[PDB]
Write an enzyme that holds these catalytic residues in place. Structure first.
Site, PDB file in Angstrom:
ATOM      1  N   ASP A 181       0.320  -0.655   0.242  1.00 20.87           N
ATOM      2  CA  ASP A 181       0.142   0.496  -0.059  1.00 20.87           C
ATOM      3  C   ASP A 181       0.813   0.990   0.000  1.00 20.87           C
ATOM      4  O   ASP A 181       0.914   2.354  -0.682  1.00 20.87           O
ATOM      5  CB  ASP A 181      -1.094  -0.545   1.713  1.00 20.87           C
ATOM      6  N   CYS A 215      -1.443   0.554 -13.719  1.00 23.64           N
ATOM      7  CA  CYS A 215      -1.899   0.870 -12.072  1.00 23.64           C
ATOM      8  C   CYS A 215      -2.869   2.115 -12.124  1.00 23.64           C
ATOM      9  O   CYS A 215      -4.219   2.102 -12.332  1.00 23.64           O
ATOM     10  CB  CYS A 215      -0.400   1.183 -11.779  1.00 23.64           C
ATOM     11  N   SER A 216      -2.799   2.944 -11.291  1.00 21.26           N
ATOM     12  CA  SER A 216      -4.403   3.481 -10.752  1.00 21.26           C
ATOM     13  C   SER A 216      -3.829   4.803 -11.376  1.00 21.26           C
ATOM     14  O   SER A 216      -5.353   5.073 -12.388  1.00 21.26           O
ATOM     15  CB  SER A 216      -4.020   4.318  -9.271  1.00 21.26           C
ATOM     16  N   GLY A 218      -1.349   5.595 -13.881  1.00 18.46           N
ATOM     17  CA  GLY A 218      -0.933   4.575 -15.042  1.00 18.46           C
ATOM     18  C   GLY A 218       0.581   5.160 -15.213  1.00 18.46           C
ATOM     19  O   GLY A 218       0.779   5.622 -16.619  1.00 18.46           O
ATOM     20  N   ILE A 219       1.165   5.958 -13.993  1.00 17.29           N
ATOM     21  CA  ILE A 219       2.813   6.492 -14.252  1.00 17.29           C
ATOM     22  C   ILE A 219       3.469   6.353 -13.400  1.00 17.29           C
ATOM     23  O   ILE A 219       4.812   6.308 -13.850  1.00 17.29           O
ATOM     24  CB  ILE A 219       2.498   7.840 -14.295  1.00 17.29           C
ATOM     25  N   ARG A 221       4.182   2.603 -10.620  1.00 19.84           N
ATOM     26  CA  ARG A 221       4.589   1.178 -11.157  1.00 19.84           C
ATOM     27  C   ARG A 221       4.327   1.559 -12.281  1.00 19.84           C
ATOM     28  O   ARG A 221       5.368   0.297 -12.708  1.00 19.84           O
ATOM     29  CB  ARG A 221       3.666   0.396 -10.422  1.00 19.84           C
ATOM     30  N   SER A 222       3.510   1.496 -13.082  1.00 19.76           N
ATOM     31  CA  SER A 222       3.614   1.002 -14.321  1.00 19.76           C
ATOM     32  C   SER A 222       4.761   1.395 -15.729  1.00 19.76           C
ATOM     33  O   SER A 222       5.448   1.253 -16.135  1.00 19.76           O
ATOM     34  CB  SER A 222       2.112   2.133 -15.253  1.00 19.76           C
ATOM     35  N   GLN A 262       7.233   8.212  -9.855  1.00 21.59           N
ATOM     36  CA  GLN A 262       6.357   9.315  -9.127  1.00 21.59           C
ATOM     37  C   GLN A 262       6.907   9.632  -7.887  1.00 21.59           C
ATOM     38  O   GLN A 262       6.764  10.955  -7.054  1.00 21.59           O
ATOM     39  CB  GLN A 262       5.119   8.835  -8.719  1.00 21.59           C
TER      40      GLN A 262
END
Ligand SMILES: Cn1c(N)nc2ccccc21
Length: 282
Positions: A181, A215-216, A218-219, A221-222, A262
């Protein structure tokens, strides 16, 4: 500098935040006018994450062709990826339309549907074989064929049918289920094992359309996923693998989608993944 010793030099000097801010300062800025039209407000999860106009994926529709998704095309590595936000309740049909139109084989998911007690994306695939999903706005049917649950990830086989033409295709769903998390994983071992499983499936290969990864937003983890893949491919291709510069590769990828990687912790984790992965390759 080389990677592994540049790494120890940043750890000892505690300067990851300064390295990461330099990247943010140098990154490309291109217009995203289509994303900001009023008719598209409910097609975007976050108001500060948008696809550039020059690299956005267009739906094959005349009414509204917009989806929050970008084509990342890496020329030297000879790899392409589509990076997208986790689908919203009102864009699940658009999502599977893109998968169909772009001829993708695989979908890579790096989040859980609920994290930190809040919804991070819609439940956009079926959970039982006998309960298929129909997307009426885009005329597609989606069926769960099989599911293999492992300790760090799950692989699903899905059937996507275009109800207009009755054509069918097999899609592979690769779901990394154990990213914490908060923060990043302590070891890159399970993330690398997961990347290698995607590779072995054929989903990243030129005989198919680009893989869809999300991911949530898209920048974050992606970005980590495609940055690690591309860097490892370049280390295999070149005469001198120590010439691969992960910061330069990241800036190249940021020409195609804003905000990739990020946090400084995500940057450090990407270095760790490439470093450990280079040893296993040989
Ligand atoms: C941003 N957003 C969320 N978070 N839920 C949504 C439902 C519909 C449309 C947009 C939505």
């Amino acid at each position: 500098m080389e990677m592994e010793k540049e790494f120890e030099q940043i750890d000892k000097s505690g300067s990851w935040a300064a390295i990461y801010q330099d990247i943010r300062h140098e990154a490309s800025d291109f217009p995203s006018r289509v994303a900001k039209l009023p008719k598209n407000k409910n097609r975007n999860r976050y108001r500060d994450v948008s696809p550039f106009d020059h690299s956005r994926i267009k739906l094959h529709q005349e009414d509204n062709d917009y989806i929050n998704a970008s084509l990342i095309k890496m020329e030297e590595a000879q790899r392409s990826y589509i990076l997208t936000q986790g689908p919203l309740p009102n864009t699940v049909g658009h999502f599977w339309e893109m998968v169909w139109e772009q001829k993708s084989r695989g979908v890579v998911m790096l989040n859980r549907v609920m994290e930190k007690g809040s919804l991070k994306c819609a439940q956009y695939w079926p959970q039982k074989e006998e309960k298929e999903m129909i997307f009426e706005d885009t005329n597609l049917k989606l069926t769960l064929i099989s599911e293999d649950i492992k300790s760090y990830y799950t692989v699903r086989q899905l059937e996507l049918e275009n109800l207009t033409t009755q054509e069918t295709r097999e899609i592979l769903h690769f779901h990394y289920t154990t990213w914490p998390d908060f923060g990043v994983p302590e070891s890159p071992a399970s993330f690398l094992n997961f990347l290698f499983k995607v590779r072995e499936s054929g989903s990243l290969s030129p005989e198919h359309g680009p893989v869809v990864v999300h991911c949530s937003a898209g920048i974050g983890r992606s970005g980590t996923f495609c940055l690690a893949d591309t860097c490892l491919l370049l280390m295999d291709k070149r005469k001198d693998p120590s010439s691969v510069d992960i910061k330069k590769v990241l800036l190249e990828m940021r020409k195609f989608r804003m905000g990739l990687i990020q946090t400084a912790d995500q940057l450090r984790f990407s270095y760790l993944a490439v470093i450990e992965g280079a040893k296993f390759i040989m």
